[PDB]
Amino acid sequence: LPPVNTDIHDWVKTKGAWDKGYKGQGKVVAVIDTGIDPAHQSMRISDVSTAKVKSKEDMLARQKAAGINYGSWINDKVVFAHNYVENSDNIKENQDTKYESHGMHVTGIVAGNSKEAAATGERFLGIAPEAQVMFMRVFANDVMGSAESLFIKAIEDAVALGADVINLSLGTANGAQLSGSKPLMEAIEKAKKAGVSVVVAAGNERVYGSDHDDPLATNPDYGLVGSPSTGRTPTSVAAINSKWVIQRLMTVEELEKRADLNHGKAIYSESVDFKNIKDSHQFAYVKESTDAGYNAQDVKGKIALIERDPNKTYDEMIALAKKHGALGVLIFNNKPGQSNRIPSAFISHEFGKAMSQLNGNTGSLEFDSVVSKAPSQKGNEMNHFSNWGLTSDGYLKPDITAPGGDIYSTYNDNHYGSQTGTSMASPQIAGASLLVKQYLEKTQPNLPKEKIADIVKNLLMSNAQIHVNPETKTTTSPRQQGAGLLNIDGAVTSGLYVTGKDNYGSISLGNITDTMTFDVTVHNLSNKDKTLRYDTELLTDHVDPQKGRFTLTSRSLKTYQGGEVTVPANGKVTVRVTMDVSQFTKELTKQMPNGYYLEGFVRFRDSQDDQLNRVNIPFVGFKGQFENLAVAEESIYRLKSQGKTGFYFDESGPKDDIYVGKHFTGLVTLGSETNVSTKTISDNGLHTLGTFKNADGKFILEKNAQGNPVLAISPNGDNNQDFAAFKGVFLRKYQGLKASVYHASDKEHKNPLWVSPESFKGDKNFNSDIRFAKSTTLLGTAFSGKSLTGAELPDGYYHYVVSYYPDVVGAKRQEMTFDMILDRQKPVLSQATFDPETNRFKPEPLKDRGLAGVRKDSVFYLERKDNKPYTVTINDSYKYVSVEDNKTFVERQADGSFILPLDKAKLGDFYYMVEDFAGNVAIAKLGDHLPQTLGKTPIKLKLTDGNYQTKETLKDNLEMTQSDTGLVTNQAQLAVVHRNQPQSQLTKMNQDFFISPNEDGNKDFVAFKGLENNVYNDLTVNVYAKDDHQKQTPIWSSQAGAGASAIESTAWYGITARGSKVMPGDYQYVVTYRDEHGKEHQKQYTISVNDKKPMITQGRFDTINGVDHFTPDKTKALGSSGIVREEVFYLAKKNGRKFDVTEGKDGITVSDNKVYIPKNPDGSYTISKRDGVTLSDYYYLVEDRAGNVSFATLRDLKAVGKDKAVVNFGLDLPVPEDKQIVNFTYLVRDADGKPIENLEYYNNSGNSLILPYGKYTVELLTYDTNAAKLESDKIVSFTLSADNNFQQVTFKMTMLATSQITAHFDHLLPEGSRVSLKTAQGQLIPLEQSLYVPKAYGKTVQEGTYEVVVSLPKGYRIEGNTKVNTLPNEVHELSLRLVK
């Protein structure tokens, strides 16, 4: 037999358990992952009668009557396999980089058992080579709502089929331990109680900031360690790099004598473009000194090249090579570490640095093939990416380390390969957990299956070897390490483990003051006894003082020592540790002002002659208050007012540029230009509030005469800065977030005038790579100068207050306040002086009406081009038209005047414009109020604003007659190609009282219009809910000052007073007013609100006189979704596009080049073939009673053959289509239960299938199980046929809403208090003490109504408001006061 590779086995000390009789034998590991190739030579058991599952037949006996009839035993080794996405039995993936498979690799690492040699000549075995493997193919892609469904199945199926150990590989960054994802936790917890060890990789995100910079020393909460592994039950696995690596190295035969360089290894660089074997047998190395040009006439050409000097990586000190020839190049570090390095490639790789200088012979060179085991350049170091820090709620995770870096394991088709990550360290602890269970299953069968897996964890952890950072000769932080490195031997032999106060092999202490005090308990498992001597190291983060950022390492403070203990036999012994750290406080809190970690280990050696019975337990606490670290970064406004900057803020380009795409905390608003020659038809997008377009169009944060910026919005209707909304850079995970507005005289923020209707939660912005956002904008925090009742809040000075909480159960609410001006008033245009001889135009000094200041005045004329004063510009690629003025600007003299080049345009045609900080702009056209008798001598010129900036009004042509209902709404066509806003106009509404409040232009609101010579005094509109049958409590009311005219004052947009869309359903719209004489009048109407785009059937197509005829299926007219318009049209091509601009009286409007086809008497439409118009330019379109519109090309309505049918699946949620789940997956099965293959989709919806006629079922597979829950049948059956050739299937669901509840107390509670939430219906939700705020008891809960009950001992009471009616996404604090 060939030799065994022990690179990872020597190091984890695994052979110590094999030789004691513990291979994988008689156990089985469930590997939930991406794929296997159960045929691989490694996939084998030695003796099949030693095994848990004994044959293909012991399986079906275990499948059935445990309750499962999918997926099969495949061989003795891979004992169960099922592909839980798509519900199939294709298990192997993937059908250079070929053959690679993640789940194959994972299994290779946990179970054995190759008796053939890999590329090195060695046999590779897993940590438990004699275990059988069930493998669940489960992996996510976000077309679904949530993969949790599929994981829980795989888990439950694992526990029921053959239990033992599950290896998960799954993670969501910065998880919590307590408020994890409930249905997945319970499934994990269920497995523990069945004796299953659940081990989970901890993540590859490393720490907050990891793809940007090291975290600032003010922000200690940089933990990225993932759920579900952050849970208390599972085993969270950090990853250390392998000391030995297996690659395709290099060899310089001339350096074979040099023995610190492996005799030619250098590994390889090869980044981005991996063209190592482009031009690479080889020869002809070179030698280059400087990275300049022609250093010494080069000397390359068909020869590799050599340099550093970090001047310009990958471009100037890379592409400069192919210049002097050389057919390839070779870089070396400028220190000993081997970093990573458009492409601009000939051939290039990075190779060591100690081997750079050793290349000092020119020389010859070869690029090795096959794999040759070489020493890792990252050796005994913690892998860069292994997750760290605490859980989101402040718990010590990970739990243990194991080799994750450059781990050699199994690939498909008898191949092997190296892949790196915490995903790989986890199967090391998977196998190790197999073995330590055999051990306890032999050592104590007097041990229950419910306490078993918690101890396998505790043995592995206490017996771990505390890692020491090589580059720094300091212990690596337990927040990065766990309880240490995996010591398999130590775990199965020592029979000692350690718990702390919490009864866990780790200790999280919460905050700490000056005296760290905690009880440690050592446990004995054998009959013989041990007497051990203990001492504790005490560590904190090291921070670099040049830049003020952590260095992701530690420094030792003082090793305090305690003494010796003597554990009993089959017994415990407690110990008390105590340390005064009051000493180190000044030095540390000066380096880390918001607090620091005080962590470390306590070690246990055998008293006489240590190294026998070496065991440890880790601890961490926080000096400060971990509950109250700042959740958000400070606003870019405050930071820049001081000299500071943001963690992700790019200060590139002009001073004080805050481009809106730039990752800060701040306020965002919408911009819209102001045009004097034509109507503005589109807006300019978001920009940062208080920034303004400077000369070169960069957005600068401009300052008022006192040196401050101004946050001001103008909630007029003009779309220039009408709202403000919060954008955040989050440091910690957030909860409870809302925006509130108070008047600024209300200094304590006790009377909200406006609150954002929703409250928000989310993740820290940890930016671990490009896929992870550095800022998040929450547009649902938009404030628009309206109150909680819809009233306009008057111009003035207000506070916009964004408040939130962290995810720690006792934390106190953090606020963050923005000074905010509402100012809706244009600045003043009075007068100026112009001098025909000097031509100097001087306006009065600049005044504003309102609190926002004047921000800039300008003079401009309209540079006519191609006979028009504006420039209409058509974006062909994005099907968009924009049009703005040709403003050319007159420079402004330092004295505040302009010289007006009257050669370029007349005097009448200059405009003076003054704009303010809130977006109001005044523009006077000089020609207004200018005497025609000019050109003589100084004048006083009157200026008035010309209302160029104004809110647009709907075209209103309507003449009301008595017969008219009085209701009006709007009308618009739905664009098919162009992405401009289709022009809309007012229409009567005397039937079909249905609205689609979707702001598309068409039936969006219900207004009321009165007869023109009738009087409507005190006209108000109130909308009542269907339930409110006495019409007592409006849900929306018109604002004050409404009449028959200004229909906008009566327009109801399907919303509540607070601005949120109402639910689908029907509502009483009541118009009330007083008379000509004095009589009261009340018209009442039933308005019905409905979104939901129509569903378009296939129709059919027949050929008639050699021309295509399309006949649509008969539209149904009943209901709100009944169809009331029906069009077939095509799009003509004019000027080479399918839309068109037309310049009208009003302004410019954009339209599709629609040509309609009449209906024929046989209900068909004749589809002529005409020059340049194909079937993809013919459309069917339908409008419902509500104004909802759908359309499809006629090309898409074919590909439904005349013998085939269509089924469409969708979810029916009782909410507005903008607050709905849309993501789910489904399996369709044919008459025999076989899944359908070879899917054709219909009208471009992945939810609509073309299928042959027959009987079928569909199964709702996955949906967002946290967002919504299913209420209708999960499996629905349907039959397709020529009569029923279109089938709707609908999964009916309800929305889920959660809230957090915290009971905060006066004083601590006596021992023996049991806090619980009492639900209506009487049940008890037990609560537990907060770790950081021990007078707090909190939980996240379903939106409902609860009471806090405590049940104290021997006599005390609680005395406070204990009842709360919970709101969705709110945090409710119920402070409570115990007394005696």
Ligand SMILES: [Ca+2]
């Ligand atoms: Ca974390």
Ligand SMILES: [Ca+2]
């Ligand atoms: Ca405005």
Ligand SMILES: [Ca+2]
């Ligand atoms: Ca609409």
Ligand SMILES: [Cl-]
């Ligand atoms: Cl103003």
